[PDB]
Structure formats: C-alpha cells, structure tokens
Amino acid sequence: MWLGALLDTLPTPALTIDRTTARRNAERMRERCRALGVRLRPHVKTHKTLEGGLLATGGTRRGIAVSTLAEARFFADGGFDDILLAYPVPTARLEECAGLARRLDAFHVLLDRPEALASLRQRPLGHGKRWLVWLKLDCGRAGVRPTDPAALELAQAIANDAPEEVTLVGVYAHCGNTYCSGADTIQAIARTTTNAVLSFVAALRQAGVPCPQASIGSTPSCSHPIPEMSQLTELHPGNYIFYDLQQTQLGSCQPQDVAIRVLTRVIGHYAHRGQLLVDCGWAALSLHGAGGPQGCAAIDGHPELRLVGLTQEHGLLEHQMDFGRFPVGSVLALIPYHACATAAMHPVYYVHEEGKVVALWHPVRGW
Amino acid sequence: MWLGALLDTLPTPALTIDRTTARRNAERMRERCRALGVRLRPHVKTHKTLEGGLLATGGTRRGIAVSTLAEARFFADGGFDDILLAYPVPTARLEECAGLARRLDAFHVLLDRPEALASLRQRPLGHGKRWLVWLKLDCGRAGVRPTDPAALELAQAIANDAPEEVTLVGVYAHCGNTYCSGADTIQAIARTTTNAVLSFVAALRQAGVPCPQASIGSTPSCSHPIPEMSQLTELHPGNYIFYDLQQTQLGSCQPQDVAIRVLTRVIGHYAHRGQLLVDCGWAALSLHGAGGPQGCAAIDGHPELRLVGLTQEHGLLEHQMDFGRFPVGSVLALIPYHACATAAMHPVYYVHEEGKVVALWHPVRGW
Ligand SMILES: *Cc1c(COP(=O)(O)O)cnc(C)c1O
Ligand SMILES: *Cc1c(COP(=O)(O)O)cnc(C)c1O
Ligand SMILES: [Cl-]
Ligand SMILES: [Zn+2]
Ligand SMILES: [Zn+2]
C-alpha cells in the first residue's frame, strides 16, 4: 500500500497517472459530447480498470466499449452495464457472449458478416432477450463498406429477419485511420467517416431499415470534433483519458493533457559511452513508437535526453551528457508513445494528485 | 481449467508451450553444461514461471538468475534458492534485497560501480550473512570493462575490503551482443567474451583477488558452445527453454526446437483486400520483430501467409489468398519473434503434450 507516498518514493519503473489530468480529460470529453448533443461511450482498452471506467463514465458505470471478453466480464463483475463488445463477435465464444447478454440489461455485439448473424441465430439467447447487434462499418480493418450493397442487405437481415431473436441497435465505425498528423487531416478522416455513416443510415431509412443509433470515434477525431458529428447518436473514443506522446505529436492534445508517465530511476552512469542507465526496459514500456527506441518515449522536462536503447529491464539515455544533473538514484518521468500499449505492461497504476499517491488501479488483462 | 483439452479448443489468442519440446530444451542445455564441466544457472526471464524454473533446473529448484525483485520474491516464495539477481543491484531497494538475502541460503547480487558497493556497506545484512556479490563485466550495456584498471580495483574492494560484510563470488558477463547471425559470429562474440573474462580472472589471481566463479552466457552462445567455456564455472542462458523465430533466424536452433506458439483464430475474410483477420493483436504478441509487422511472427506450416498488420486485438494476414484453405474459425499457430516479449503479454501459458493441455503455467510480472 502506497497511499500518501511521494512519487519519487515509488518502486521503479512505475506507471503513474495524474488523477487531476485524467479527471479533466474525462470531463472534457463528456462536455464535448454534451455540446454536440451525443452520448459518450468511452472505450476502456487504454486502461482496462474499473476506476478509469468510473471516471470516463462520469460515475454512472453505464455505457462503455471493451476490446475483449476478459474486459466485458471484468466490467460486468464490477457492476457496469450497457457494455459493447467492440469487436467482430467471437462466434467460437458465443456461449460466453450469451452468458453476458443474459446477466446484463444491455450487452452489445458487433458484426460484419452474414455467417456471424447465422451463428447468432443458431445460438438464441432465450430468456426474453435479443442479441443487440451493431453493424460494423468500414469507412480499413474490419466491417462492411457502406457502399457495398452487401452492407445494406446485412443491415436489413440483422434488423428484420428475426426480430424476436436479434435486433439492429445501430451502425458502428472506428476511424482508426486518423493515426496522419494535424487537425485538418484528422478532421477530414472524421468527415469522410461521419458522412459515409450518415449516408448509410439515410440509405437504411429509405430502405425502411430501422437503425436507431450511429457511433463513431477515435481519440484524434473526438479531441477536435466537427459539427457533422452532432447528427450521430454516440462517440466512442478511449485513449483520451490518458493521452500519450503519439497523440501529442498528432496534435490531438497538448503535453499538459498527458496523464500517464513511466517513472524510472537512473541506475548507472557509463561515461565511456556518454549514457545514463535507467531501470525502465521494454517490459515496462513496450516497443511502441520504435517502428528506433528514441521514438518510444520522451523524458518529461528534459528535451536534451533521448532513449537510444531498451532491453527487457534496462534503458539507455543519451544527451555530451551532464552526469551531475542526473545522479544515480534520481527519478525521471518517461512520457510513453502509446498509452494503451504501455498500460498493458503494468499490473498496477499509481494514481496521484499534488505529488502524492491517492489510489492504486489494477487493470484486467488476457482474453 | 483446461487440462485434457485439445489445442483447437482453447480460447484464442492463446500462448501454448509444447512441454515435450520445452523439457527437451531444458535437458539439452543441462547436458551441454555437464559435457563442458560447468554448472547451469538458467535465467528465468523468458517464462517467469515456477514450472519453467523447475524444468530448467532439472527438478532441483536451485540455481537461477532473475531480472527483477518481483521474480526473486516469486521464486523464493516458490521454494527456490541460489537465486542471482542478474541486474545492477537496486540501491534504492536495498531493504528488499537484504530481506531476500536473509531468507535465502544464497541470494546473489551484481554490481559494477564503487558507489553501489558503498551502498551495500552502509546497509549491512547482519545475521551472520554476507552480501554475495558478482562483479558485472562489460566485454555493451552494464558492467565494467575488464581492461579498465577500475575493474580490477573494484573486484579487489568487493573481495577484501570488508570480508565480514561482503564477498566476491565471481565475475558475470552477458554476451547480449550475440543478438549478428550465424554460428561463426556468435561463437566469435562468445570467444571474445570468454577470453576477456578468463583474462580478467587470471589478472585477479595474479593480484591475489579471490574469484571462485565465472559466469557467462546468452542463448545463442550456449546453443553452440565453444571449448573455452569449460574454463568457466557456470553458464546462464534462459531463452533456450522456449526459443523463438529470432533464435531460429540467428541459427541458434531449428524450427523444431521452438516450444512456444500463439494460437489465433481466423475471425474474418476480407476479399476486397485479400486479407484474413485473426484474433491475435499486439496485446497477445508484442511488436518485437517489427523494427514491419511481418517480422513479428511466422505462421507455422504456412510460409504463404504473412502478418501485414497488428492492432491491439486484431491481426491481418495476407498470402492471392485462398479463403477455403482457412475457414473462419480455423486455428493457426503463430511463431513469435521474441519469446521473452510474447510471454510477457500472457497471464497463462497452455502447456501441452500430444495435442492436449497438460498444465497451465502462470507467470509473475511487475517489479
Ligand atoms: C480503440 C477503439 C476505440 C477507441 O479509439 P481510440 O482512438 O484509441 O480512443 C473505438 N472503437 C474501437 C473498435 C477501438 O478498437
Ligand atoms: C537475459 C539475460 C540472460 C539470459 O540470456 P538469453 O540470451 O536471453 O538466454 C543472462 N544474463 C542477463 C543479465 C540477462 O539479462
Ligand atoms: Cl512491444
Ligand atoms: Zn491505442
Ligand atoms: Zn529475450
């Protein structure tokens, strides 16, 4: 137990979350959605914690998206509901999906293939419940292309072919392609996606296919929303609760919006090479940002320094260095490239305010 | 509980370990060391499990190397002893190190700085125990260069300056630089390292510095050992228990020596792009091998296929494809680039023999 502890006191490497910053990020996204007239369904995959979920959800524990059944189960067990499995429904795991649909007032699934609908049909929920299905739109990884006649036909089938067993809740797009720098290009992807979705829904209405909801979002696009988004019903970003270096470089946020660090101690000086040795390796950071290591993290408040090497449990920093500025034992705060990836390496996050630990959040992991 | 289950039955993505292969790998390294007349101190960081430790150690639970205090504690609690913390000793965590030194018959630490020795001196163990110290030799990340006069002086200090509180057990080098392809260049690094170590120890003997042990090793060098190694006392490879694609490419092993897979299900076909969608993203694999994604894994038994994309929970495979060869629902076995990195993403390993799960191993993680 580390409650009350000063940050420089923590065992490193340590993932830290500034709760003032995270709370602010959570509330700001809630406000953007309120201003647009749309609901927020935060994706939880960046943190995978009940505590982060509670913040993102403004205390309601209702209305989230998850990336795995491990998360769906974990959040369900933590008293959340209105949980969307934002993943082509795992037809090999339908018994588990149906278990969740039966426990929850609203467990939502996505699909983009007729065979998946067929699988849902041959595993009815019973219990007076319907599979709550969203059609995933590809506007380029999963989903159906909205201009593909197949898309409209699949929507029709989801909506009307077995109204007693399955229902079409809405369409769902994830504009993951926003990960092009600049507000202008981000907003362009947002607009193509938004308009493609809106045009598809308009086609659905004309074809008499009821589609009450329409959900898009990624952190870049929801950090600089466009007015066209007010014609949707819901936005589902997730990374924004923490942000990270990549989002900062993308222009999604300012450095002050990044809640996450990895704290690391200088554990050695190697003058013959001009390097600091730190106790944060890829086990604490991941290699996200390297495709080299310089791209994986910046040192907060120290532009002079750069990561030049990562092994499992060690990192090497280079400036000509200044070894008196960085005694062995000093603590540096790394700003990670990708919060989701870095958070996935940590069994605990030390959540702080005013320099002191205020909470410990423990994420779920696995599948 | 999945004991007895057929592999195609597991929830994917699933890290699987062929126990016949792992056991064979464990026994083979033990035999190489026996043939050389040296001890084996397996490093556990590739698997971080008590079960893997028991295999590597030939059932003794004695004589391992670990990369973190989390591992030292976990293995100590699992009844292991003669545990070496193969890491410049964490002078900010000395109370924890001393706790371990006090519980264990033999907890070993490494250092390469006089200040670290000074820290050990100002935190005596008491209890009739001595800090068991190895001098880390850099023959290029941590350690002292053996030709650096400072090295000999630090060895002298460790050995003789407070014989009641601190003792020099031996010198420790990790020829991590073997990670240059080919047996010839691997063995060259092994030889430079081995000879540098042997020359340093010879210098120590001439200077009257007692140094009873001398430990080197990496998986590449211990997979093709050289006779000069018989002049050492111990070898400390670790990855070999599983091996991986990188070691296969390095020539350390044959494909048949790789015990580890990540099983993944085909979850979609996207003909308009010629791609299979699988349920293994970087959350199950890591991005090791990308610095792109094609380098992170091969598909076992399917040279035709290649990873072209990884998101957190999805992967994209490309051949012109053949969608009938790979129905949605089929299970493919990914051979990961770096076992250590992939294993760090999994809360459980499904260990199998003759196609069926035989054990579940749960690794420790964190710091
Ligand atoms: C990650 C994800 C989101 C949230 O996007 P971010 O840009 O990470 O905030 C929404 N939908 C899906 C399907 C996702 O995978
Ligand atoms: C990883 C490691 C080893 C084991 O080396 P492998 O090539 O991974 O088998 C030995 N010593 C140290 C210090 C290590 O970090
Ligand atoms: Cl990674
Ligand atoms: Zn992300
Ligand atoms: Zn490794």
Tab-separated table of C-alpha atoms in Angstrom, chain A residues 18-256:
chain	number	residue	atom	x	y	z
A	18	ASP	CA	-2.094	12.126	-12.713
A	19	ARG	CA	-5.667	11.916	-11.475
A	20	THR	CA	-6.269	15.667	-11.878
A	21	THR	CA	-5.279	15.305	-15.529
A	22	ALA	CA	-7.244	12.069	-16.107
A	23	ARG	CA	-10.361	13.502	-14.413
A	24	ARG	CA	-10.044	16.654	-16.519
A	25	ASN	CA	-9.656	14.548	-19.699
A	26	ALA	CA	-12.701	12.506	-18.761
A	27	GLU	CA	-14.855	15.542	-18.024
A	28	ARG	CA	-13.710	17.386	-21.148
A	29	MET	CA	-14.759	14.543	-23.463
A	30	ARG	CA	-18.074	14.360	-21.624
A	31	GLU	CA	-18.540	18.072	-22.247
A	32	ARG	CA	-17.685	17.847	-25.956
A	33	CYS	CA	-20.325	15.153	-26.310
A	34	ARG	CA	-22.886	17.159	-24.355
A	35	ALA	CA	-22.175	20.224	-26.527
A	36	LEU	CA	-22.707	18.091	-29.659
A	37	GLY	CA	-25.925	16.516	-28.334
A	38	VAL	CA	-24.487	12.963	-28.449
A	39	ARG	CA	-23.767	10.255	-25.854
A	40	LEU	CA	-20.255	9.254	-24.855
A	41	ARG	CA	-19.446	5.523	-24.736
A	42	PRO	CA	-15.803	5.519	-23.665
A	43	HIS	CA	-13.679	2.651	-24.858
A	44	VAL	CA	-11.826	1.186	-21.841
A	45	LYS	CA	-8.956	-0.580	-23.593
A	46	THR	CA	-6.401	2.097	-22.790
A	47	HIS	CA	-6.600	1.459	-19.051
A	48	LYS	CA	-8.805	-1.623	-18.530
A	49	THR	CA	-9.611	-0.550	-14.962
A	50	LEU	CA	-12.885	-0.193	-13.123
A	51	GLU	CA	-11.576	3.094	-11.675
A	52	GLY	CA	-10.806	4.565	-15.095
A	53	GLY	CA	-14.200	3.320	-16.275
A	54	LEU	CA	-15.889	5.101	-13.414
A	55	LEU	CA	-14.115	8.365	-14.317
A	56	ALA	CA	-14.787	8.101	-18.029
A	57	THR	CA	-18.440	7.313	-17.384
A	58	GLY	CA	-18.859	10.262	-15.017
A	59	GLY	CA	-19.639	7.941	-12.109
A	60	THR	CA	-22.523	6.064	-13.833
A	61	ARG	CA	-20.853	2.709	-14.637
A	62	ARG	CA	-23.033	2.668	-17.754
A	63	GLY	CA	-22.103	2.911	-21.424
A	64	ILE	CA	-18.670	1.590	-22.333
A	65	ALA	CA	-16.947	-0.248	-25.135
A	66	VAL	CA	-14.437	-3.077	-24.475
A	67	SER	CA	-11.996	-4.954	-26.721
A	68	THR	CA	-12.110	-8.459	-25.206
A	69	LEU	CA	-14.421	-10.816	-23.325
A	70	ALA	CA	-11.976	-10.620	-20.374
A	71	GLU	CA	-12.852	-6.877	-20.152
A	72	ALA	CA	-16.599	-7.480	-20.661
A	73	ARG	CA	-16.582	-9.977	-17.799
A	74	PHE	CA	-14.396	-7.796	-15.539
A	75	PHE	CA	-16.517	-4.689	-16.049
A	76	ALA	CA	-19.753	-6.670	-15.718
A	77	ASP	CA	-18.449	-8.096	-12.434
A	78	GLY	CA	-17.630	-4.516	-11.355
A	79	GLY	CA	-21.268	-3.543	-11.798
A	80	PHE	CA	-21.113	-1.878	-15.183
A	81	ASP	CA	-23.853	-2.303	-17.761
A	82	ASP	CA	-24.543	-1.119	-21.297
A	83	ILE	CA	-21.286	-2.686	-22.375
A	84	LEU	CA	-20.476	-3.020	-26.028
A	85	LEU	CA	-18.003	-5.692	-27.180
A	86	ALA	CA	-16.399	-3.541	-29.874
A	87	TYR	CA	-15.048	-6.452	-31.842
A	88	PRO	CA	-16.416	-8.699	-34.572
A	89	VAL	CA	-18.426	-11.028	-32.375
A	90	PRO	CA	-16.387	-14.176	-31.471
A	91	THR	CA	-18.562	-16.912	-32.869
A	92	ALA	CA	-16.306	-19.515	-31.242
A	93	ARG	CA	-17.144	-17.933	-27.850
A	94	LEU	CA	-20.897	-17.481	-28.228
A	95	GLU	CA	-21.774	-19.314	-25.030
A	96	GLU	CA	-19.706	-16.720	-23.144
A	97	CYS	CA	-21.287	-13.849	-25.088
A	98	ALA	CA	-24.770	-15.212	-24.352
A	99	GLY	CA	-23.882	-15.586	-20.674
A	100	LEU	CA	-23.082	-11.871	-20.610
A	101	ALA	CA	-26.158	-10.896	-22.629
A	102	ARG	CA	-28.235	-12.819	-20.062
A	103	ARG	CA	-26.647	-11.169	-16.957
A	104	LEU	CA	-26.623	-7.648	-18.365
A	105	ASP	CA	-29.516	-5.351	-19.160
A	106	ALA	CA	-27.564	-4.412	-22.270
A	107	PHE	CA	-24.612	-6.330	-23.715
A	108	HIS	CA	-23.958	-5.227	-27.312
A	109	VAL	CA	-22.079	-7.085	-30.016
A	110	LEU	CA	-20.822	-6.018	-33.469
A	111	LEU	CA	-20.645	-7.986	-36.687
A	112	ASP	CA	-19.910	-7.516	-40.323
A	113	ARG	CA	-20.526	-10.975	-41.852
A	114	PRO	CA	-23.770	-12.845	-42.620
A	115	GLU	CA	-22.216	-16.039	-41.259
A	116	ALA	CA	-21.812	-14.311	-37.894
A	117	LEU	CA	-25.516	-13.400	-37.924
A	118	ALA	CA	-26.254	-17.033	-38.810
A	119	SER	CA	-24.165	-18.109	-35.797
A	120	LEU	CA	-26.179	-15.782	-33.569
A	121	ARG	CA	-29.385	-17.253	-34.927
A	122	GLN	CA	-28.285	-20.810	-34.104
A	123	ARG	CA	-27.406	-19.782	-30.533
A	124	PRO	CA	-30.567	-17.951	-29.432
A	125	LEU	CA	-30.397	-16.070	-26.125
A	126	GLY	CA	-33.818	-17.090	-24.835
A	127	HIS	CA	-34.872	-15.509	-21.541
A	128	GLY	CA	-36.881	-12.888	-23.425
A	129	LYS	CA	-33.661	-11.296	-24.637
A	130	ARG	CA	-32.408	-10.326	-28.090
A	131	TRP	CA	-28.873	-10.168	-29.434
A	132	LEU	CA	-28.179	-6.417	-29.503
A	133	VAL	CA	-26.284	-6.084	-32.730
A	134	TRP	CA	-24.393	-3.234	-34.330
A	135	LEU	CA	-23.292	-3.439	-37.947
A	136	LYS	CA	-19.599	-2.560	-38.094
A	137	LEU	CA	-18.957	-0.156	-40.965
A	138	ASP	CA	-15.602	0.029	-42.713
A	139	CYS	CA	-15.310	3.605	-43.931
A	140	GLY	CA	-9.605	-0.357	-43.067
A	141	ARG	CA	-9.553	-3.450	-40.871
A	142	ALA	CA	-12.998	-4.902	-40.038
A	143	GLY	CA	-16.581	-4.060	-41.084
A	144	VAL	CA	-18.585	-3.749	-44.288
A	145	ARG	CA	-18.053	-0.890	-46.752
A	146	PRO	CA	-21.166	1.328	-46.676
A	147	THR	CA	-21.237	1.468	-50.487
A	148	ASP	CA	-21.166	-2.332	-50.659
A	149	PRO	CA	-24.746	-3.437	-51.434
A	150	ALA	CA	-23.919	-6.346	-49.120
A	151	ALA	CA	-23.829	-3.864	-46.251
A	152	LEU	CA	-27.405	-2.675	-46.663
A	153	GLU	CA	-28.545	-6.299	-47.073
A	154	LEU	CA	-26.775	-7.422	-43.920
A	155	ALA	CA	-28.310	-4.473	-42.009
A	156	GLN	CA	-31.742	-5.468	-43.278
A	157	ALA	CA	-31.161	-9.072	-42.153
A	158	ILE	CA	-29.905	-8.040	-38.708
A	159	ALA	CA	-32.855	-5.668	-38.271
A	160	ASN	CA	-35.867	-7.555	-39.598
A	161	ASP	CA	-35.167	-11.201	-40.331
A	162	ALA	CA	-35.647	-12.463	-36.771
A	163	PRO	CA	-36.951	-9.510	-34.774
A	164	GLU	CA	-37.644	-11.859	-31.856
A	165	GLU	CA	-34.048	-13.098	-31.528
A	166	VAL	CA	-31.852	-10.350	-32.959
A	167	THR	CA	-32.135	-6.597	-33.309
A	168	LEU	CA	-30.108	-3.920	-35.075
A	169	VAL	CA	-29.172	-1.278	-32.496
A	170	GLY	CA	-27.119	0.873	-34.868
A	171	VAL	CA	-24.020	1.207	-37.013
A	172	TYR	CA	-20.515	1.444	-35.607
A	173	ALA	CA	-17.401	2.823	-37.279
A	174	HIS	CA	-13.923	3.288	-35.807
A	175	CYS	CA	-11.923	5.850	-37.711
A	176	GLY	CA	-8.644	4.255	-36.640
A	177	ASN	CA	-7.067	5.674	-39.812
A	178	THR	CA	-6.718	9.090	-38.119
A	179	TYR	CA	-3.475	7.577	-36.763
A	180	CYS	CA	-1.960	11.197	-40.454
A	181	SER	CA	-0.937	14.138	-38.261
A	182	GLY	CA	-2.683	17.534	-37.997
A	183	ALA	CA	-6.175	18.679	-37.056
A	184	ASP	CA	-7.026	19.300	-40.713
A	185	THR	CA	-6.334	15.753	-41.934
A	186	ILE	CA	-7.743	14.219	-38.737
A	187	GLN	CA	-10.968	16.135	-39.260
A	188	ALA	CA	-11.006	15.074	-42.916
A	189	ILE	CA	-10.994	11.401	-41.947
A	190	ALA	CA	-13.650	12.263	-39.330
A	191	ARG	CA	-15.735	13.918	-42.023
A	192	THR	CA	-15.444	11.116	-44.617
A	193	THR	CA	-16.298	8.626	-41.906
A	194	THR	CA	-19.117	10.740	-40.453
A	195	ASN	CA	-20.641	11.405	-43.874
A	196	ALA	CA	-20.252	7.805	-45.011
A	197	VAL	CA	-22.059	6.704	-41.851
A	198	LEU	CA	-24.771	9.353	-42.193
A	199	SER	CA	-25.246	8.441	-45.852
A	200	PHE	CA	-25.505	4.749	-44.990
A	201	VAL	CA	-28.102	5.486	-42.279
A	202	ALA	CA	-30.019	7.645	-44.771
A	203	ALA	CA	-29.969	4.709	-47.196
A	204	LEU	CA	-31.191	2.490	-44.366
A	205	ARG	CA	-34.110	4.842	-43.606
A	206	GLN	CA	-35.030	4.946	-47.288
A	207	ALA	CA	-34.965	1.115	-47.384
A	208	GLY	CA	-37.088	1.017	-44.207
A	209	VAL	CA	-34.314	-0.475	-42.085
A	210	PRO	CA	-34.693	0.816	-38.547
A	211	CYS	CA	-31.338	1.984	-37.216
A	212	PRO	CA	-31.716	3.995	-34.050
A	213	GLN	CA	-28.006	4.570	-33.184
A	214	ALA	CA	-24.829	5.588	-35.023
A	215	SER	CA	-21.467	5.520	-33.232
A	216	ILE	CA	-18.053	6.639	-34.432
A	217	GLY	CA	-14.902	7.839	-32.817
A	218	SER	CA	-11.226	7.717	-32.165
A	219	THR	CA	-9.265	9.916	-29.812
A	220	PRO	CA	-7.913	12.132	-32.545
A	221	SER	CA	-11.284	12.808	-34.077
A	222	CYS	CA	-13.126	13.325	-30.794
A	223	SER	CA	-10.386	15.660	-29.484
A	224	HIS	CA	-11.251	18.051	-32.360
A	225	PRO	CA	-14.832	17.204	-33.220
A	226	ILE	CA	-16.663	18.511	-36.262
A	227	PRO	CA	-20.249	19.772	-36.288
A	228	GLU	CA	-21.363	16.901	-38.556
A	229	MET	CA	-20.889	14.609	-35.543
A	230	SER	CA	-23.946	16.104	-33.889
A	231	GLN	CA	-26.001	14.086	-36.406
A	232	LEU	CA	-24.717	10.849	-34.854
A	233	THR	CA	-26.012	9.429	-31.558
A	234	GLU	CA	-22.754	8.432	-29.866
A	235	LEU	CA	-18.980	8.804	-29.874
A	236	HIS	CA	-16.647	6.120	-28.546
A	237	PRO	CA	-13.067	7.356	-28.082
A	238	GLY	CA	-10.944	5.821	-25.277
A	239	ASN	CA	-7.242	6.805	-25.303
A	240	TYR	CA	-8.040	10.439	-24.398
A	241	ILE	CA	-8.465	9.612	-20.732
A	242	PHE	CA	-4.652	9.366	-20.546
A	243	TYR	CA	-3.330	10.587	-23.921
A	244	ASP	CA	0.371	9.994	-24.719
A	245	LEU	CA	3.288	11.164	-26.836
A	246	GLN	CA	1.807	9.898	-30.060
A	247	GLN	CA	-1.391	11.913	-29.510
A	248	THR	CA	0.723	14.933	-28.608
A	249	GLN	CA	2.637	14.535	-31.901
A	250	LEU	CA	-0.664	14.032	-33.738
A	251	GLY	CA	-1.945	17.371	-32.393
A	252	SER	CA	-4.824	15.678	-30.514
A	253	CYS	CA	-3.640	17.147	-27.239
A	254	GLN	CA	-1.067	19.352	-25.538
A	255	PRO	CA	1.730	17.967	-23.368
A	256	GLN	CA	-0.229	19.099	-20.300
